[PDB]
């Protein structure tokens with residue numbers, strides 16, 4: 001079996017998986033809307049009671065499976081619980097990251113496209129008033145994506161956007177086809193320092209921003225001034241638990257697959273804790289110092305609330321580029337921003353396609369070349385739905401990227417810590433550990449952590465599902481039909497895998 005060459009490479013590859021666009025775009029928006037500085041209270045608590053425990057568990061499940069030559073949940077769940085229902089549940093740990101990758105690589109291609117356009121100066125150049133500056137950039141993004149101008153739910157991506165997507169798929173393949181150590185690990189050792197350097201430069205350059213409407217200090221002020229009155233709202237606590245779960249990328253099955261390349265008696269306790277801490281530092285220190293302070297420095301603290309409510313996608317692809325065009329060398333500054341987002345996305349997408357690759361290698365005995373190429377073919381083909389059907393991305397992101405991940409994360413807990421055995425699971429986590437997991441975490445993993453996820457799943461299901469099922473355009477069924485078919489296809493592959501094993 002393939003293995004990570006160094007401990008540093010493993011940690012950077014794991015942190016690289018976690019650190020993405022959400023760190024620099026989603027977190028700052030969530031924090032500003034939920035108490036600002038006071039949001040750090042439930043954020044840390046969620047990190048201690050949910051994020052950290054579940055991550056140790058996914059590392060453990062991965063390493064345990066890897067020792068027996070299996071990197072994906074259909075096989076791994078069966079090893080933890082020899083039941084037919086376990087293999088089926090395990091399909092979700094293959095289905096979720098595949099479906100997400102189908103839309104994420106496209107989003108990733110946007111950042112490369114924008115990076116190129118900004119580097120060469122092929123960007124709008126306004127003109128005054130905020131709407132007069134934002135609108136040319138709004139249209140810039142809309143023309144790139146091909147946002148519907150009529151009543152049809154049809155996207156029409158520019159030829160440039162399509163070609164960049166092809167290039168982006170090529171780059172993902174180039175890294176993945178070289179394997180774990182010479183590909184993913186090797187890239188992580190280059191991408192993470194580059195990511196850190198670009199982020200620091202952007203933080204510094206943002207801090208120097210001075211406009212008649214305000215400064216960057218006003219931005220850090222608005223964002224970090226505690227509003228403890230919001231701590232009463234359970235939605236804030238739900239948002240904190242949600243943000244922690246999303247940022248660490250739990251319940252995607254990607255962590256499990258990566259951990260399956262960790263040697264049997266190699267540490268996962270400290271390595272896991274370190275990777276998680278890196279994502280958090282990158283999230284609160286770097287992510288919280290760029291987008292929001294810049295938006296406040298330029299538009300004034302008077303528009304800070306409106307900016308936060310506008311969303312993370314508006315902030316990263318419209319608002320920030322618009323502000324850049326109004327600063328000295330902002331064209332190059334825009335390049336660095338999207339270059340940053342691209343590498344952050346690329347380190348995440350190579351991780352997200354690895355489970356499907358690992359399934360074909362471990363269970364269907366495909367060579368790495370064939371496994372990578374076929375995985376890329378599935379992703380590339382399926383991505384045309386996201387590229388041409390409006391809101392297809394939103395539907396996939398809800399079922400797989402939102403509801404699915406919390407459900408699967410809870411499924412991981414129950415199978416590992418309740419079915420497989422809490423004592424066996426506890427030993428499996430701490431085995432080979434440089435440091436040992438504090439004894440208190442045994443009860444957290446067994447009672448507290450699943451309780452939090454259960455609440456999160458129930459609340460979101462009652463809140464969002466009726467809306468999605470009743471107030472959406474009929475075209476969502478196109479996306480639903482296709483991704484359900486993808487599940488059936490993966491279920492069939494699991495069936496072929498067990499029939500091949502019975503023969504050999």
Ligand SMILES: CCCCCCCCO[C@@H]1O[C@H](CO)[C@@H](O)[C@H](O)[C@H]1O
Pocket residue numbers: 384385388389
């Ligand atoms: C779900 C993926 C399907 C999207 C494929 C859309 C391809 C768009 O192709 C369309 O072909 C037509 C000719 O038949 C042309 O008239 C249109 O201009 C062209 O855009």
Ligand SMILES: CCCCCCCCO[C@@H]1O[C@H](CO)[C@@H](O)[C@H](O)[C@H]1O
Pocket residue numbers: 154385388389
């Ligand atoms: C998810 C599906 C995305 C829809 C793809 C949009 C393509 C719309 O394109 C349509 O293609 C038809 C070709 O059969 C032509 O008859 C129409 O003239 C053309 O507008």
Ligand SMILES: CN(C)C[C@@H](c1ccc(O)cc1)C1(O)CCCCC1
Pocket residue numbers: 021022025026107312313393394397401402
């Ligand atoms: C779970 N949600 C809702 C967040 C995702 C998203 C997807 C679609 C969308 O319209 C907004 C956010 C997101 O993860 C996709 C791009 C990276 C930042 C946000």
Ligand SMILES: CN(C)C[C@@H](c1ccc(O)cc1)C1(O)CCCCC1
Pocket residue numbers: 017018019020022097098100101104246247248249250252254348349351352353397401
């Ligand atoms: C840890 N994060 C945030 C990255 C993940 C992700 C998940 C959802 C999403 O909307 C964006 C990225 C991702 O790595 C999951 C597997 C498929 C590629 C993206």
Ligand code: NA
Pocket residue numbers: 018019020022023246247248249279283
């Ligand atoms: Na993250």
Ligand code: NA
Pocket residue numbers: 015016017018019020343344345346347348349
């Ligand atoms: Na990443």
